[PDB]
Design a protein around this ligand. Structure first.
Ligand SMILES: [Ca+2]
Lengths: 5, 158
């Protein structure tokens, strides 16, 4: 989860 | 999209348009292991079955094995996953939403079992092409667990 770098 | 083992097994995030699927084909992808849960797929495509049918429509063979985000497959799912990935050697694509956590975990486990690598080496191999592969403690613990029972897993897979 927590994607978007 | 990235290959961990050239044209044999790779990883990817969740595609947003069909044109991205065509790119997969150009790279040699033939089969796709879909890891995100229904809601995650629906969130981007509007409907889970529509997405799966679109993979088939475009000549790819899909298998949907829903794994919670940041989570790992159950033993039953993992056996299914390994048998699927080994039933057809070339053109295997595994994907999640980001192509980093669940995907990195499955790819690493794949290397642990097929190449006899330690968890550290397996993750190393995946991070060479996908930085940050494997995100959570549970995913890391799953890999250690798989390595510790490699024999038992190979026995059941073959
Ligand atoms: Ca999280």
């Amino acid at each position: 989860n927590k994607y978007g770098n | 999209m990235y290959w961990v083992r050239r044209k044999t097994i790779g990883g990817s995030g969740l595609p947003y348009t069909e044109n991205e699927i065509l790119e997969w084909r150009k790279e040699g992808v033939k089969r796709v292991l879909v890891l995100p849960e229904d809601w995650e797929i629906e969130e981007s495509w509007g409907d889970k079955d529509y997405y799966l049918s679109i993979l088939k429509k475009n000549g790819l063979q899909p298998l949907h094995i829903p794994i919670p985000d940041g989570g790992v497959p159950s033993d039953s799912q993992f056996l299914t996953i390994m048998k699927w990935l080994l039933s057809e050697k070339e053109g295997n694509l595994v994907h999640s939403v980001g192509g980093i956590g669940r995907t990195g975990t499955i790819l690493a486990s794949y290397l642990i079992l097929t190449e006899g690598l330690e968890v550290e080496s397996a993750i190393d191999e995946v991070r060479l092409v996908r930085p940050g592969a494997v995100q959570t403690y549970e995913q890391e613990m799953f890999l250690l667990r798989v390595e510790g029972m490699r024999k038992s897993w190979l026995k059941n897979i073959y």
